[PDB]
Design a protein around this ligand. Sequence first.
Ligand SMILES: *Cc1c(COP(=O)(O)O)cnc(C)c1O
Ligand SMILES: *Cc1c(COP(=O)(O)O)cnc(C)c1O
Lengths: 367, 369
Amino acid sequence: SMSAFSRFTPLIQSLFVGPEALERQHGRKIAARIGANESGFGPAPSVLLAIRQAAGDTWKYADPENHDLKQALARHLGTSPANIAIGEGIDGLLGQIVRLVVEAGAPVVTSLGGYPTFNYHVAGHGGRLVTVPYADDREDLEGLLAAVGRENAPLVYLANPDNPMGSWWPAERVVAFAQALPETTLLVLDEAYCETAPRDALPPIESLIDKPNVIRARTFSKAYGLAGARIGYTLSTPGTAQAFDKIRNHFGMSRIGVAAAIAALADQDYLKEVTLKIANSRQRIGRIAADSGLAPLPSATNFVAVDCGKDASYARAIVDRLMSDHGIFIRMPGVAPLNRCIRISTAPDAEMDLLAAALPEVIRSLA
Amino acid sequence: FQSMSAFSRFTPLIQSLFVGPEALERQHGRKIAARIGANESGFGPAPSVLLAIRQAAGDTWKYADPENHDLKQALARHLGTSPANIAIGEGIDGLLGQIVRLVVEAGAPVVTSLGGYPTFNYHVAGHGGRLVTVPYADDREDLEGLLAAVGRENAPLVYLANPDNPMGSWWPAERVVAFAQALPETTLLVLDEAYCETAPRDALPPIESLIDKPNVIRARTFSKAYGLAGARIGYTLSTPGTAQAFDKIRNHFGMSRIGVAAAIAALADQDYLKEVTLKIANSRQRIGRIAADSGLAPLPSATNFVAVDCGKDASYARAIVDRLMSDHGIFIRMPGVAPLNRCIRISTAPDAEMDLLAAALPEVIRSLA
Ligand SMILES: *Cc1c(COP(=O)(O)O)cnc(C)c1O
Ligand SMILES: *Cc1c(COP(=O)(O)O)cnc(C)c1O
């Protein structure tokens, strides 16, 4: 505005619609909230109990060392807490990673149409984004490697499994990619979808944990059902993990969120149950898509990408009509040819039943 | 410094770069009996806020509204201002980091008080700013000295806390407004009002006195009187253009969904806030009595703590802090620079904690003679 402070940095001077904003725009409530990959299955009953029990302690700051959470993670994962950093979701950690490495004008390599929050952080720190097209619906490992080399980029992003296509690579291919990078380039390996992936997609911890130039990011926001709590963590060498202590808000963690995450980790039975429900919902979405003449894509995530078989304007019309006519909130990718697709999050049966009724009608109404 | 296993191409700045109570419990192998060192409000948030948290628990699978619309609307109503003037962040500490990021280029001078709020200094250093520190004047942040340092350095950023941490002192609103209006319009003032709720009304500038200034931002929190430190909810008051700059560099979905619900409920329960601010005031008086009974000198306060001059040197004050913890499980803190570090800082608390402190402090002082 004309009212802004006149001496923001030159970078600052040069610089997704959420579901609540959609409701305000459309003047209606969302009937199926299946567009942001939030887990409507919810966190475990034991986690809800832990939150309610923790409420009375919310006057205290969280432990700035995150000791109990790091220990719990370390015990679960079979690695040391010295290898672990805690942050405000993967999104918060991604911002910190960009800050740690990216100077104004530095090139940063990612996939064309890949996870947009990463791109937001890169731009906000003055990085120059270098994008690599997907190769047959997968993030192109060989192409990412070459772009890094061409630019001598200090940072590269890979999500495995991928958002928004839901695709994945075998662990051995991801490891080979990571090992091939120059040690002067940091890889952030975004494993937001660890919990829903086939085990053979995920590198063993020991395969990468000694590399100073690899950091892996995981979250409680997806399968664990705690998106609103903002708890993420990274796995790296201890020297790389320690760097977060130079630039993090030490008391920044939500005390209730940390309690919830510790409880979530403890309830592996619930995680097993919910991941089976997510898988079932992926199959249901695939059936619904196919019944409407669309092409669902294989997925290792908590959503299904669906190829709508025409162009981007058709996919957009489907998203908009689902919201306008049925109060169904989905999303779509933002670049060709990925944007031939829509992306539908998994959900309980009530939402699936609504989607099953609505999607054919939308497709019929567009013909 | 960085270790041999750290990524070898962290920025040159990065390469060049308080004990919490939980760590103290681990070190001493005991639970804290009186947690009165981090200015957390042991009075707690309102009963209605606890209910709101428990009711919101089932929705925690959803991300918070990235626009923070309902919270901004609630704050706008409470404050009597436009929601366009309001930015939301992860406490004042989170907002301070953002403010530094918005203004501070490597090497830029940033003015603050010597021994003033340390998290601000942490953020400045972390963004490559050059800290320019101004000694306190008689236990107050030296407005004249801050203004001189800004002028000398043409500093783009200056920090003022009113009321102050760690001394608890304050300036009248008219002096703060005069200070703010004397700064160059090319210098941003962050006016840290963490202690708004416990301050005398005449310490606080009216919103209208500063709200049209593009170079003033005021920061407030739910962490202190409202009893929600663990929820991490802070907000700022500024012009809309200044508020909008946060949208360029903030983690849009970063807010705790339960924390937002708690903050909205906390705002609604002004009867509870009134009650708790009176309890905090009473506890300050009790701490003053306890201090005086042990031959120490409590300082006036407009915060939720009392600074106490222990009348000797920094090593004496340190010994008091350490013995209270080791021998009695009592957690307090002290300032980190002379001559402020002649002092200890004791947070307010309910009667159970005050009673423990009243028994323990004389024993500690006696043991040190
Ligand atoms: C959902 C998601 C994130 C963000 O996770 P948070 O931990 O909630 O910040 C990051 N990366 C990918 C690929 C995601 O899908
Ligand atoms: C306690 C305190 C803060 C931190 O507040 P949060 O909102 O919890 O981040 C900031 N400034 C001062 C002066 C404080 O006393």
